[PDB]
Design a protein around this nucleic acid. Structure first.
Ligand code: NA
Ligand code: NA
Length: 327
DNA sequence: CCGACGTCGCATAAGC
DNA sequence: GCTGATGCGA
DNA sequence: GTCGG
């Protein structure tokens, strides 16, 4: 796991990944290329041949070939071509705006809209989400230092508690695992009055409060259980102002809360391992529940959970700190 | 050879 | 107006 | 594109 060891190769794979997703609309080729990129990124030798790479889970014949060409010429003909392609490179770029995905990008570029500037000239053609995306294009591609996250957390936990001291809220994501930086803030929310069996107002009042103290500045989307929007730390005195940040707030019912918390803490890799484990011990785990099987594979009713540990207990695993859930 | 590859809440489209 | 498909982000 | 039934 050292940067420019196979950087050339993994930046390559990652470029191709984006073109598959954003231009070709082949999300599964997109994940193939990314998966290759990962397993190569972890590989602790400078790759010498496509054949050496092929040995890795997720590197097949086609990518092996690419690596050979890259290794001998320092570039890829296809990648070089698509990069200079006016239409395609503009479609790929436009998708960097939040709310513009591969379909809307494609339509824009069809009607000659290819640049941020062009988007600015055409706001009347953007939905609410997209306008927010444009407006904060740069801020949203910035990382969030952990210190700022802590500051944001102070504000979130404070105002949630002042709306109702019985609410529970957890900031998960790479934040909860110790990451020195985060992509956004992901808040998980529950209340003792909200169970799977069980007002239709619990998420709304929390969001309202966060707007009233001007933490939440914009709304991408909001319904009865998931909120997605924008936030910002209060500008220190005369100091330079903070970036607007992405924040999601999820209302989960209490008897599914720690499954939710477990799931949205990750990492993805650790989740795959633990869901694998898991089956072998006789259980199925998803973001909501842990259920038992079932001599024929028939899933029983969901078991009670009242903490993260509870889940680990069910499946013969000693509790592992968010600290140590890289895998 | 050929299908799976995560899933789902919310905004908006689109056909009725 | 209704519906439930499709795009999007996570 | 890669893996696997
Ligand atoms: Na292989
Ligand atoms: Na986007």
């Amino acid at each position: 796991p050292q940067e420019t060891l196979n950087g050339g190769i993994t930046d390559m794979l990652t470029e191709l990944a984006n073109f598959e997703k954003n231009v070709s609309q082949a999300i599964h080729k997109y994940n193939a290329y990314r998966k290759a990129a990962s397993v190569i990124a972890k590989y602790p030798h400078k790759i010498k041949s496509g054949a050496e790479a092929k040995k890795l889970p997720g590197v097949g014949t086609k990518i092996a070939e690419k690596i050979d060409e890259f290794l001998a010429t320092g570039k890829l003909r296809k990648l070089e071509k698509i990069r200079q392609d006016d239409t395609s490179s503009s479609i790929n770029f436009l998708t960097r705006v939040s709310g513009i995905g591969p379909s809307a990008a494609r339509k824009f570029v069809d009607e000659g809209i290819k640049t941020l500037e062009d988007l600015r000239k055409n706001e009347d053609k953007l939905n609410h989400h997209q306008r927010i995306g444009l407006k904060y294009f740069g801020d949203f591609e910035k990382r969030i230092p952990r210190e700022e996250m802590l500051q944001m957390q102070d504000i979130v936990l404070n105002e949630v508690k002042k709306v109702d001291s019985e609410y529970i809220a957890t900031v998960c994501g790479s934040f909860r695992r110790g990451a020195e930086s985060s992509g956004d803030m992901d808040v998980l929310l529950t209340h003792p009055s909200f169970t799977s069996e069980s007002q239709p107002k619990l998420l709304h009042q929390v969001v309202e409060q966060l707007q009233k103290v001007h933490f939440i500045t914009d709304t991408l989307s909001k319904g009865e259980t998931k909120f997605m929007g924008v936030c910002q730390l209060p500008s220190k005195n005369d100091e330079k102002e903070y970036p607007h940040r992405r924040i999601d707030i999820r209302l989960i019912p209490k008897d599914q809360y720690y499954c939710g918390v477990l799931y949205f803490t990750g990492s993805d890799i650790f989740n795959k391992n633990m869901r694998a484990h898991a089956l072998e011990k006789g259980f199925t785990i998803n973001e909501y529940t842990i259920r038992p099987l079932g001599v024929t594979g028939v899933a029983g009713e969901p078991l009670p959970v009242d903490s993260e540990k509870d889940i680990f207990d069910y499946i013969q695993w000693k509790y592992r700190e968010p600290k140590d859930r890289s895998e």
